[PDB]
Structure formats: C-alpha cells, structure tokens
Ligand binder design. Structure first.
Ligand SMILES: CC(C)=CCC/C(C)=C\CC/C(C)=C/CC/C(C)=C\CC/C(C)=C/CC/C(C)=C/CC/C(C)=C/CC/C(C)=C/CC/C(C)=C\CC1=C(C)C(=O)c2ccccc2C1=O
Ligand code: SF4
Ligand code: SF4
Ligand code: SF4
Ligand code: SF4
Ligand code: SF4
Ligand code: FES
Lengths: 407, 125, 183, 220, 188, 165
C-alpha cells in the first residue's frame, strides 16, 4: 500500500540522468513500481529561435540539439533545405561522400559517448576513459576537418562549409586503421564481462510490439530483431551506394542494445573505409551561385579567413560576385514556400525534421522529431518492475541525449 | 518615525539612481522618511541584510556577477524575518523566475518610476 | 568557523595561504553537467587531458561534497530552480564556473526558454567563453579560479576585502556607458 | 476548398514586412501559398496508398475525411479533415495494405494569416512493412484549437500531443492528460506561436546593446 | 464607372482599370518584374529598360513600366519567356559593369534594389574584364545629401521627383552618354 | 573462459604504457590548424587596418556576438583603405559560439580566427573584447594606422594584394 511505497526524484542532478532528466520513480523497497519523466529541464527554444535566423544560420542552432550527433542534425537540416530548394540531386558527389563519412564517424563518436556514460553509470569506471580516448581520436579528426570539436556547423545547405584539409584524408585513414584496435579495448572491458552481462542482460526488456506502439527507433528497435534502418529503407545522402549490414539483435534488452551499438561502430568503420575509397577530388558545394555558400575559407599566417583569391574576386574584379557574396552571407538564400519531412538514421534512431518555408530567407518552422524524445517514452516500460539499479541500466540503454529531447 | 531603510542592490549605478529617484525621501507624505543603502556586490548585500534593520530590499535581477533573483532566494532562505523583496526583471519572460525567487513584487526594466513607487508602497503598507 | 575568529597577523595570513593552497587542490566539481558542455567536461576528464592532474577527478555526485559547481551547459527556465537548489545544497566555501557561452550569458539562445546567464540565479566566480569551450579552455578557467581561491581572504580580512570590493564596485560605470569612439 | 492554401500575403518587393527602405517598391502583392491539391496521378506508391485508403474508406467517408492530397518534393501529405482524424488513422494503421504501424510524432506549426486554419498538426507516419512514408495534416482554427487525440491509435503521439499543446495550445481532446511537458505548468502562453515574442534580452556591449533579433529588421 | 480592361500576364488572366501600366498589373497579380526607373508616383520614363517583357504582336520587348494595358493584350514576363528573361539579364549585366565594388561600404547595402534585383534577375559572375567608369566620390549636392555618381544607375528618379513631385529642379542629369550624371548646377 | 577476464588485461597492459595525456598548461597539446579560436582583426602590410566596417561579420553572426560601427576614412585620419573603416568593433565572447560565420562573411579577410583559445574572466564585461584587444599586433614594416595609403596605390590595389611595407 501507500505506507510501503517511496516516491523519489531520480531527478535532474543525478549522475545517470545526464543532469537534466527527471525520473520520478515510485519504488516499493527498491523495485521501481512506477516511472514518470519530467522533461524540458534542458529546453532551449531552439525551434523558435531558428525562425529569427536565416538559413545556414539555423545550422548552428540545429547542431546544438542532440549535440552528440551534430553531423546528423546538420545533415537532416541540410537535406531538408535542399529538398525544399529541389536541389537534392545537385549536391556534389564529394559533398555527399563527406557527409556520409562524417555521419558515420559521428555515429562512432555518439556510440562511444553512450557506452562510456552507460558504463560509468553502471560502475565501469575505465569504460568511460577508454571510450573517450577513442572519441578523442575521432574529435581530433573532426577538429581538423571543421575547426571545431563539437557543435560543428560544417555541413551547409548545398554542400559543406569548406573542403577537407590536405591531411584530413590521411587522418581518417589512420582512424580506419587504429579505431577497431582501440575499440577492442573497450569491448574487452564490457562485451564478455560476466558482471556487465549480468548487469545488462535481461534488463529493460521491450518487445517489438512495444517499440512500434511507442514509435521507438534506433538501437532499441533493432534490439528486437527488426532490421529497420533509414539508411537502407528510405536511403539518403547516397547511402544506397555503400555495402554495410544493418546491425540487429533479438534479445530486446539492454545488453542487446549495447551489442548493437558496439557492432554499429564496426559497421561505421567499414562504411568510412568505403567512403575513403569512393572519395574523389571535386567541388563540395552546389555549382548554382544563386544558392552556393560564397565563402572560401583558407589558412594563412594571420589565421583562418576568406581566401585572398575570393577577396580579390569580390573586392577587385567581380561586381556580381560581390553582390552574391554580400546577399548570400547577409540574408542568405530564400527557400521556395513549401513543407517537407526529412528523416535520417541518427545513432539513437530516426531523427526526423519537419521543415516549413514561407518563401522567405528564414525557416518558417523547423521541428526535430529527435529520437531520444520518443525513446524516453520507453522508460516506463523498461523500468517498471525492475530494481533502481536495473532502471539505471535501462535508461543508459535508451541512451537519451537531453539536448535532442528538449530542444 | 523611524526612517525606513531600503537596500538597493544593483551592479549598475544607473539602476540604483533610478530606484532612488522614483522613490524619494518620502514615498508619500503619509509614509515615514526613507533611507537608502546602496550595495553593488552580492556579498555586501548579504552581509547588510544579515545585520538586519531593513524594511525593503530592491534587488536588480540583471546584476552582473550575481543576479537579483538569486540574491532574493538566498536572503529568503538565509535571513529570518527578512524584509519584503522587490526584484527588477530584465524581461517579461523573467516573470516566472521572479515568482520562483519569492520576491514580494517584481518590476520590469526599464524601471517605471510610478510602478516602482506603487509596488514599494504596497509592500510597506 | 574558528579559523575566522583567528586574529589578524602572521597567523591569519598563514591560515589563509594554507587554506587557499588546500582548496585550489582537491577542488571537486559537482556532477552537474548540462547540454553539450557536459560532454566537454567529460572529455577534460578523459585521458587526452586529465582533470585529475589538478586533484579535481572526484566529481562529487552529491552537492554536499562538491566544492565547484561547473554549470557547464545552458540553463533553461525550468532548470534554474534546480540549479539554485543544487548550489544551495553545496556547503561553504562554494564556487561556480559558468562554462560555455550559454551558462555565462545565454550564448546564442537569446530567447524565453534560457535564463541568459547562470549569474541570474547563483553567484558566478569565473566566466568561460566557448560553445563548447575546448578542454584546454576549461583547464585555463579552472586555473584562473585556482588563482582566485589562493588569494581568497578569511575572517577580518574577508570582511575588509568585502568592504573594499564594495567601495570599488559602487563606482564602476555600467557597460552601456562605455561609449568610447561610438559615433 | 480547392485553391492552394495561402498562409501569408507579403506586400512589396524584397520580402519587406515594413513600409520599404526605398520608395516605389512596396506595391507588389504576392500571396504565399502552400501547394494545393495534386492532380490525381500521384507518383510512386502514393497513388496505390490513396487508392487503398479510398477503398477501405467509403466514398462518402473518403470525401468527408481527406480534405486535400499534396505530393510535394515526392512526399505525400494528406490534409485530413479534423474530427475524422482518428478514423483515418485507424484505417492507415490497421489495414494490411496500408499498415502504417509507426507514427513518428506530432509537429505543430502556426499560420496566423491562415483564416480558420491557423494551427496545423503534422503526423509523419511510416509503414516499415511496406517501407512507405506519408504525412497527415490536420488544421484547427486559432479560436477552436481542438483536435482529436490519436492516443488510442498511436500511443507514441503522447508527449507529442503534449509538446504541441505546450508550444501551440492545440487541445488534443481525448488525450489521457494534456499537460505541459516542456514549459512549466505555471508558464503563460505557448512559445512557438508566431504571436508569442522571442523573449530575448539585448546583448550588452561597451557603450551599446543589440536588441534581440525579433525586434530588429528582417527581410523574410 | 471605371472601365476594366482584361489581359493575360504570363498565362494568368486579370482585369485592371484602363490606363494601368503592365508593371502595375503584374504587381497586382504577384509577378515580380525587375525595375529601377519605374516609380508608381512618378510619371513613367522608360529609361533603365530593366522592366522589359515580351508582348504578343510586338517585335521588340516592351518596357512594362511604360506600356498601358490593352483589352486583349498577351504578356509573358521573364518567368514565361526566354526572350524577356534574356533581355532583362542583359540589361542587369550592362547595369552592373560600371557599378563600383562598394557593397561592403555602400550605405544602401542590404537594402539595395540593385543588389536584390541582380540576385533575382542577374547573372552569377561578371564578364566585364575591362575598365570601369569612375567619378570623384562622394560629392555633396547639399548639406544633407551626398552623391556617389559611380553607383548611380541614372534612373532619373531623383530628378523626376525633384521636377514632378516637388517643384524644385535644383538637381538634373548633367553631361551626356556614359558621362551623364545627376548634379547640381555649379554650387547652388 | 579467460575471455570474461579480458578487461583485466586491458587495464593492466595500459598501466605499463606511457600515459597519453597532453601536458596542458605547461606543454599544451596541438590544436588543429583550422581551429576556430579567437577572432582577430588583421592589418595590411603597410599597417592599415583591413576592417572596412561593412558589418557583414556582425550581419552573419547568429548570436549577435559582434557589434561594429563604421566611420569615414577622412584624409586627416585614415585607418583603412577606401572610404569606410571600423571605428568601433566589439565581440561579446560570452555570446560568440565560435561558428566562424563571421570570417566567412568578411569580404576583406580583415577578420580571421587564430588558433589561440585561452580566454576566461571573473567579470562579464571584461569578455566584451573591443577593437584594441582584437587588432593584430603591429609587425615589422607596419606604421601606425592613422596614416595615408601607400604611395601610388588605392583600395583596389590593397584588395588585389599589390601593397608592400
Ligand atoms: C580528518 C582528519 C583531519 C584527519 C587527520 C589526517 C588527515 C589530514 C587525513 C586522513 C585521511 C583522509 C581523511 C583523507 C581525505 C581524503 C578522503 C578521505 C577521500 C576523498 C578522496 C577520494 C575518495 C579519492 C578517490 C575517488 C576517485 C577515484 C574519484 C574519481 C571519480 C571519477 C573517475 C570521476 C569522473 C566522472 C566524470 C567523468 C564526470 C562527468 C559527469 C558530468 C559532470 C556530467 C553530467 C552528464 C552525465 C553524467 C551524462 O551521463 C551525460 C550524457 C550525455 C550528455 C550529457 C551528460 C551530462 O550532462
Ligand atoms: S555554450 Fe555551446 S556547447 Fe555549451 S551548452 Fe551552450 S550551446 Fe551547448
Ligand atoms: S548601390 Fe551598388 S555598391 Fe551599394 S549595395 Fe547596391 S550594388 Fe552594392
Ligand atoms: S542618383 Fe538619381 S538617377 Fe542616380 S540612381 Fe539615384 S535616383 Fe537614380
Ligand atoms: S571585420 Fe570584415 S566583415 Fe567585419 S566590419 Fe570589418 S571588413 Fe566588414
Ligand atoms: S565565431 Fe560565430 S558567433 Fe562568434 S563572433 Fe564569429 S560569427 Fe559570431
Ligand atoms: S523600370 Fe521600366 S524601363 Fe526602367
């Protein structure tokens, strides 16, 4: 009865709740009798603030929700903008290849963070450090390519912010060579560990029926054996040209999801090797000057800035070039009025983007169906009936990123 | 008969000047005289209110190193029988936090002299 | 605290310097990451860097054992009460590091949902730019906070320093009045 | 209706809401119309999906429920009439040939200039079995923002109906508990409505400050 | 009773008062015809030639800013006529060859009809490898108004206003040919 | 199965490997050459400021982290080629998100992003970096900004790169 039940806030400020997730748990003893989620402690109004910035500025906003999958947010946004523009077929092959490579490295990075934080929440102290070592290799690559460790705005409507640096390809090859070896260390700590399996196996069970009813996606859905992946079904960014296997498991529990993530990292490494093979020199931005981002970043003794060649072209020789630079930089492209829904396979499931343009230079309405937001609806199913310790494992298996949840 | 002592907390001297201008030596001739204690740092405001002897505290929600709402919450959680707190909010959407601060009244920026005076009268009455 | 009742002189000066040296080390952060900056704190703890080298490895899960509250993220409106509760439930001495532009000033999210700076709800000791600040920037800010702590006074010196800081702060004009060279 | 859905009327060249920085360019009147009904031969599997939907639904019911069909950018959007939303949702989910088991959420959008249809709710539905995608669009007036909650058909719509109510005030009647999820329950207003101000503060600078972007000029 | 004439712009029919200019009819219909010298409140001059459209039965493109509607006219703008689009883009190019590379420093930048109409109806890159016309800039025509003749497109809107609207023709189009330039008399 | 103990090998082995930590602050690690560090206002080889005060950098900033005001380059006091220069230039680094759109926007390469990143302060105002802090240091051959353009040269020459100390 009531006398034997506590109700406790797993609360925002809690190591396993990513600081801004409030699991309100009614527990009889230490069994989670009931679960509720206070959400929105990390709400930011990004969706509304987008409406007051032009396109190619909303990239900097969207990349900051689901911040563990920055490139996925950016790619979804840019795919939507291009679809409204009707230029999805005009994206240079090099730009699409780089987008795929970056999304796959980003999947590896996001899975590394998920495994690290899950292991730490479950006491696997060294798991966090090894995962973040691998992630730091990946982030060195990302920093070299984009100049930022996180919240990159590198993927832009119509292509990329800038082409890869000369050394980026060699760094990505070095990743493709060393990353599986390093991931072997993290897998050894956890994969076959008796304590890890006991702590995750059979925990947070959620059948395929539950995943469908709650609209779950990503590793949670594919832990039920359903090989659903937006990269195969409804391909985008040319994923159809890559030979990779959709990782799926039949356990339906936390360990199945963990194994799915581990295997997805290897699949992403394979896809990145394929991207490296396919990568060819060429433009990374649409040729249409009316839409192409006019900037041409280059390095010098002074630092990173518009290349002197572009400066000469726009300030010394081309009046049309100057007008195009001025306008596309300042107010940006104006997207034809329309309403589009574009989905990508972010590490946590279908990251959907409903985007509406009223013909203006700013997005009329941008909404992210972030997979974490829907996945968190599975906490009640995956925690109720288990112990609080099992609840920690189940929530870690859901691997929510509250930035994408609240937005 | 006692001069009501009012604590005005704001990193911005102009906000303190505006507060001390909307309010005068007397809010109304029916009210007692008013004495103002300007404080620019949250530690100093906390120390002053620890000494007590204040009838009202006006805390600028826009204070740079330590916003007024935080100071209001702190004083109501730390000083027993603390004076009523009036908070100056930098925007309309801060109203919610103004409630959370438990400040007896909130006055948006820019400080309307008459609105501030009326709120102060309501709190002192 | 009896350390505050100690009279000035060499005794109080030595107590102050010892306390500053002790507290700059073992400055345990609170396990209170928000938004994407939290990932950068974790990276700072990661092997490539080592927060542990500064004695700060123990991220006190409970606010009771935490010394430094690295907000490290964007504070939404609904979260400000929680953040203030955590800050209060820490025990003196307390320091707050506003890691990232969002924590320090609301950053790019100048809208209803964000608080527009942690300092709106808790005293901020160091502001750290970046979005997110790379781990070296976090370590730089932490070392600046260490320098601030080392010089932190106590007792009668604390009271005198508070009075002097008040006298100084009462005079500084607001940023809006620094019209240098504006047309 | 049959004409394209005008959501806003912009007057003057250069996408300027105000009077105009240069005289003489403010006389252009261009209505911003979202695409209208598509001609019947829908591309791809959309034609099959609509044929099946019209077969399962009676001709009378199909006419009463489906307000419009828009095939834009090779994406199918069924402007479904309010009230009938639960019926068509059940038909889409349960029918073996349609079988849209996975509803991906509910997105609110606001059209303050769209008379009688200011609030729109978008239901992205996916059928994994057939590997198909569609969207349902349900319009409600700002004065009567009620919409039938799909909670019985698609439980996932919970936390999406709640979120869209929080950010737009769309009352999904029949929802088990339509409480705010993002904003505090004590919050006033629905932030993502266009009339709701951005709520920013001026950015400070030595000797100056930059008002929030919503107050400053724009040329959308 | 005002007489309504009817005509098709592109392929859409519309009825407008007799005497209406094609540019005004297009505005009412929502077609954005590029224009510089046209002004609704100034008497049309047809100078810049930017508003050219194809009209059935006319060998030459017609300046929509000077063409009165006719009861059965068929008009197709750059949106539905390659000839009209080519004419308008050629006019824009010729308009930009002599223009200064001043957008970063130009006060009109961001609110410049020339920038917007070059984006919407202009080529993406220059072909003008030759030398640009140049004038001393900025010269003052009064205590308040600065004049940068290099940026002038000689649309005569300033002069046409100072003559028609305000009866103060103290500025006028001086010189001839490429040297033509708005100006005050000598110092008046 | 010794496989279940594989983790013990990983940690033990890593005990005998050299730690991979970078030695910041004494031996700071290498940031990427393209890293988005502090903005910097650059000068021409003769010392004139590149910033023409067009405010495009401020225009493109999504966080409104740049405030710029232009002024005329009067012959008595010229700071940049052409007729405009950036008289007041402030970056609110508590609003900057390092996105780099400003440098992409700048049409003169006046604004670059150096690899320097160390920045922090206990005061909100001190992180509003003005023109004085952002201007690149005056190198050899550069003169004070308030000086006339290089002899026999004009703005176009500066932009085309035909200027030397
Ligand atoms: C008493 C007396 C005077 C006696 C006289 C003698 C004398 C002086 C001494 C006697 C001996 C004594 C008493 C000594 C004193 C010291 C003592 C007793 C012990 C204390 C020291 C101690 C226990 C040291 C060892 C403990 C230890 C090994 C600590 C290390 C712990 C580690 C590894 C912490 C790192 C964890 C970490 C990476 C934290 C980051 C997490 C944070 C903050 C982010 C939050 C967060 C998380 C966590 C997500 O999951 C997440 C996921 C996705 C997106 C966002 C987030 C997010 O925001
Ligand atoms: S400062 Fe940047 S990285 Fe940090 S929480 Fe804010 S948006 Fe995220
Ligand atoms: S008038 Fe010329 S220089 Fe000025 S903004 Fe327009 S196109 Fe650019
Ligand atoms: S100065 Fe006169 S003629 Fe020249 S562009 Fe301006 S209005 Fe037209
Ligand atoms: S830094 Fe560049 S973009 Fe900014 S005002 Fe100066 S020249 Fe213009
Ligand atoms: S880095 Fe981005 S946000 Fe920061 S000043 Fe430059 S453009 Fe603005
Ligand atoms: S606008 Fe008609 S010719 Fe100039």
């Amino acid at each position: 009865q009531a006398g034997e039940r506590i109700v406790v806030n797993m609360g925002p400020q809690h190591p396993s709740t990513h600081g801004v997730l409030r699991l309100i748990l009614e527990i009889e003893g230490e069994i989670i009798t009931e679960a509720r989620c206070g959400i929105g402690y990390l709400h930011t109004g990004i969706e509304k603030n987008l409406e007051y910035r032009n396109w190619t500025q909303g990239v900097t906003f969207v990349t900051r929700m689901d911040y563990l999958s920055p490139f996925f947010n950016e790619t979804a946004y840019c795919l939507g903008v291009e679809k409204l523009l009707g230029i999805t077929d005009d994206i240079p092959e090099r730009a699409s290849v780089i987008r795929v490579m970056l999304m796959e490295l980003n999947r590896i990075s996001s899975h590394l963070v998920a495994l690290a934080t899950g292991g730490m929440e479950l006491g696997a102290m060294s798991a966090m450090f090894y995962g973040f070592r691998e992630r730091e290799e990946i982030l060195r690559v990302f920093e070299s390519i984009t100049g930022l460790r996180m919240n990159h705005a590198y993927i832009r409507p119509g292509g990329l912010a800038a082409d890869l640096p000369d050394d980026a390809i060699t760094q990505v090859r070095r990743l493709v060579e060393i990353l599986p070896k390093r991931l072997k260390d993290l897998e050894d700590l956890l994969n076959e560990n008796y304590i890890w399996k006991a702590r995750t196996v059979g925990v947070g069970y959620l059948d395929l029926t539950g995943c469908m009813a709650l609209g779950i996606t990503g590793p949670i859905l594919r832990s039920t054996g359903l090989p659903h992946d937006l990269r195969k079904a409804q391909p985008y960014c040319g994923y159809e040209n890559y030979e990779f296997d959709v990782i799926t498991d039949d356990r339906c529990d936390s360990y199945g999801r963990y194994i799915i993530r581990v295997k997805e990292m290897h699949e992403s490494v394979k896809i990145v090797e394929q991207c490296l093979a396919r990568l060819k020199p060429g433009p990374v931005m649409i040729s249409d000057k009316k839409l192409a981002w006019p900037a041409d970043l280059k390095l010098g003794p002074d630092g990173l800035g518009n290349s002197p060649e572009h400066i000469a072209k726009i300030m010394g020789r081309s009046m049309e070039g100057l007008i195009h630079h001025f306008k596309l930089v300042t107010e940006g492209i104006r997207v034809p009025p329309g309403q589009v829904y574009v989905a990508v396979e972010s590490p946590r499931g279908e990251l959907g983007v409903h985007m509406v343009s009223d013909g203006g230079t700013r997005p009329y309405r941008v909404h992210y169906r972030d997979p974490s937001f829907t996945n968190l609806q599975a906490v009640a199913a995956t925690c109720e009936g288990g112990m609080v310790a099992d609840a920690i494992a189940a929530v870690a298996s859901i691997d929510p990123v509250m930035g994408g949840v609240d937005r | 008969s006692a001069p009501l002592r009012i604590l005005v907390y704001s990193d911005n001297p102009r906000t303190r000047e505006q507060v001390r201008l909307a309010l005068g030596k007397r809010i109304h001739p029916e009210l007692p005289e008013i004495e103002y204690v300007d404080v620019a740092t949250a530690p100093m405001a906390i120390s002053q209110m620890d000494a007590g002897g204040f009838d009202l505290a006006i805390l600028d929600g826009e204070a740079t190193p330590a916003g007024g709402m935080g100071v209001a919450k702190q004083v109501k959680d730390e000083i027993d029988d603390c004076p009523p707190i009036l908070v100056l909010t930098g925007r309309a959407d801060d109203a919610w936090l103004a409630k959370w601060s438990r400040a007896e009244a909130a006055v948006p920026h820019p400080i309307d002299p008459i609105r501030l005076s009326d709120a102060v009268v309501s709190l002192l009455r | 605290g009896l350390e505050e009742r100690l009279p000035g002189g060499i005794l109080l000066s030595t107590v102050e310097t010892v306390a500053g040296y002790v507290r700059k080390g073992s400055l345990w952060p609170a396990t209170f990451g928000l938004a994407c900056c939290a990932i950068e704190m974790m990276s700072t703890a990661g092997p490539r860097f080592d927060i542990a080298r500064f004695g700060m490895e123990r991220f006190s899960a409970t606010p009771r054992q935490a010394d430094l509250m690295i907000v490290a993220g964007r504070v939404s409106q609904k979260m400000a009460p929680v953040l203030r509760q955590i800050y209060d439930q820490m025990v003196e001495p307390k320091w707050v590091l506003a890691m990232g532009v969002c924590a320090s000033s609301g950053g790019m999210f100048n809208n209803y949902a964000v608080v527009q700076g942690v300092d709106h709800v808790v005293p901020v000791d160091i502001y750290l730019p970046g979005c997110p600040p790379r781990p070296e920037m976090l370590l730089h800010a932490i070392l600046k906070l260490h320098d601030k702590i080392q010089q932190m006074p106590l007792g009668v010196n604390r009271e005198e320093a508070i009075r002097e800081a008040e006298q100084a702060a009462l005079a500084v004009p607001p940023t809006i009045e620094l019209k240098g060279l504006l047309r | 209706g049959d004409e394209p859905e005008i959501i806003a009327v912009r007057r003057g060249m250069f996408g300027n809401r105000d009077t105009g920085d240069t005289s003489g360019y403010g006389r252009l009147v261009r209505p911003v119309a979202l695409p209208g009904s598509t001609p019947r031969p829908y591309g791809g599997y959309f034609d099959a999906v609509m044929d099946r939907l019209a077969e399962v639904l009676g001709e009378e019911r199909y006419a009463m429920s489906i307000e419009r069909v828009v095939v834009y950018r090779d994406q199918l959007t069924i402007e479904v009439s309010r009230v009938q939303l639960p019926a068509v949702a059940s038909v889409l989910r349960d029918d073996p040939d349609l079988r849209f088991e996975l509803c991906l959420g509910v997105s609110g959008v606001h059209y303050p200039e769209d008379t009688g249809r200011e609030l729109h709710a978008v239901y992205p539905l996916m059928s994994i079995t057939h590997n198909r995608r569609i969207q349902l669009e349900v319009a409600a007036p700002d004065a009567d923002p009620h919409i039938p909650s799909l909670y019985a058909v698609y439980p996932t719509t919970d936390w999406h109906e709640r979120e869209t109510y929080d950010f737009f005030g769309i009352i999904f009647d029949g929802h088990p508990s339509l409480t705010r999820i993002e904003m505090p329950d004590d919050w006033e207003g629905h932030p993502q409505r266009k009339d709701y101000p951005l709520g920013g503060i001026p950015v400070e600078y030595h000797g100056a400050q930059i008002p929030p972007p919503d107050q400053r000029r724009s040329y959308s | 009773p005002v007489e309504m004439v009817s005509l098709t712009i592109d392929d859409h029919e519309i009825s407008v008062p007799k005497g209406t200019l094609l540019i005004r009819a297009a505005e009412l219909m929502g077609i954005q015809i590029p224009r510089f010298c046209d002004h609704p409140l100034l008497d049309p001059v047809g100078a810049c030639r930017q508003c050219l459209v194809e009209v059935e039965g006319q060998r030459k493109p017609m300046a929509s800013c000077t063409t009165t509607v006719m009861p059965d006219m068929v008009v197709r703008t750059q949106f539905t006529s390659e000839a009209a689009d080519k004419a308008q883009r050629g006019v824009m190019e010729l308009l930009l060859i002599n223009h200064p590379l001043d957008c970063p420093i130009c006060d009109k930048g961001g609110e410049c009809p020339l920038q917007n109409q070059a984006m919407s109806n202009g080529r993406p890159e220059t072909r003008f490898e030759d030398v640009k016309r140049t004038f001393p800039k900025p010269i003052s025509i009064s205590s308040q108004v600065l004049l940068d003749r290099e940026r002038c497109v000689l649309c005569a809107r300033c002069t046409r206003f100072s003559s028609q609207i305000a009866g103060d023709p103290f500025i006028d189009l001086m010189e001839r040919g490429a040297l033509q330039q708005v100006g005050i008399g000598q110092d008046k | 199965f010794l496989d279940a103990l594989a983790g013990f090998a990983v940690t033990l082995g890593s005990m005998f490997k050299k730690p991979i930590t970078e030695g910041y602050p004494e031996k700071p690690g290498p940031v990427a050459p393209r890293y988005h560090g502090r903005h910097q206002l650059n000068r021409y080889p003769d010392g004139l400021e590149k910033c023409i005060g067009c405010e495009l950098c401020a225009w493109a900033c999504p966080a409104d982290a740049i405030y710029v005001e232009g002024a005329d380059n009067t012959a008595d006091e010229r700071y940049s080629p052409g007729e405009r220069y950036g008289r007041v230039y402030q970056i609110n680094y508590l609003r900057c998100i390092g996105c780099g759109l400003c440098i992409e926007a700048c049409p003169t390469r006046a604004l670059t992003m150096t690899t320097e990143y160390e920045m922090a302060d206990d005061n909100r105002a001190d992180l509003i970096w003005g023109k004085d802090k952002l201007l690149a240091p005056l190198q050899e051959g550069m003169q004070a900004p308030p000086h006339d353009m290089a002899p026999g040269k004009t703005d176009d020459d500066y932009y085309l790169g035909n200027v030397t100390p």
